[PDB]
Amino acid sequence: AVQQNKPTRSKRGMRRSHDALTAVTSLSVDKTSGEKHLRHHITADGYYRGRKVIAK
Template identity: 60%
Template sequence: MAVQKSKKSVSRRGMRRSHDAMDEPTLSTDSMTGELHKRHQVTATGYYRGKKVVNVKVAS
């Protein structure tokens, strides 16, 4: 089992943990439908930046 040579300071521990926080996803409003979607992602209806890029099949 690995054992550290010396104690890590509270400051070092805090610096390591500073990257562990969860961020809320950045949302954008689609100009065609007005729905919210994640940035740089195709919407559920298949639009990206106001243009139809994917043909979405309707589930029946």
């Protein structure tokens, strides 16, 4: 139920070796607006594949 000995700081780091997160490898560029956006996502200005989706 509870520990019998105090784990060391070395053990704590070992368990934490899989906690690192990964950044986005790359992001797309719109064909018409020219701004950067996530792939398969709407741009900040409301463009998508140079079609000018609703930007309300």
